[PDB]
């Protein structure tokens, strides 16, 4: 429950653990988010970078 | 201090059933609430390592 906060892409951290402080911290830091990993891709509503999409995603991350 | 001396094949009396009710309640409550606690643990476990 503490290493879950040590995640760069804050969108997952706000999906989980208390949303208020997470957003405030990431906002004062001006934290930019390239949405690697799955949960935040699930938030934004596009392909998962794990399953089939990985191939597709492997085509994009390399691009 | 006095274990039950009956089986369900025979007929239990009042005391034995009243004493078994304790353990029945304890165990059923354990199930009902432990299931939610276990789901909570599953959520924490997915969030820590899913990416």
């Amino acid at each position: 429950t503490k290493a879950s906060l040590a995640t760069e892409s804050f969108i997952s951290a706000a999906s989980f653990q208390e949303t208020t402080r997470v957003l405030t911290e990431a906002a004062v830091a001006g934290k930019r988010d390239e949405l690697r990993g799955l949960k935040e891709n699930v938030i934004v509503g596009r392909l998962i970078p794990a399953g089939t999409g990985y191939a597709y995603h492997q085509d994009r991350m390399r691009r | 201090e006095t274990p039950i001396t009956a089986n369900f094949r025979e007929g239990l009396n009042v005391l034995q059933y009243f004493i078994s009710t304790h353990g029945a309640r304890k165990g059923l409550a354990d199930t009902a609430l432990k299931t939610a606690n276990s789901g909570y643990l599953t959520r924490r476990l997915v969030d820590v390592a899913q990416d």
Partner: peptide
């Protein structure tokens, strides 16, 4: 004294109530 949370306390990296010490 706890059956299932014996795993949760372990995973949370929570220390025991009265911990032992290890020399350096």
């Amino acid at each position: 004294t706890g059956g299932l949370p014996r795993v949760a306390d372990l995973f949370e990296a929570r220390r025991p109530k009265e911990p032992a010490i290890l020399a350096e």
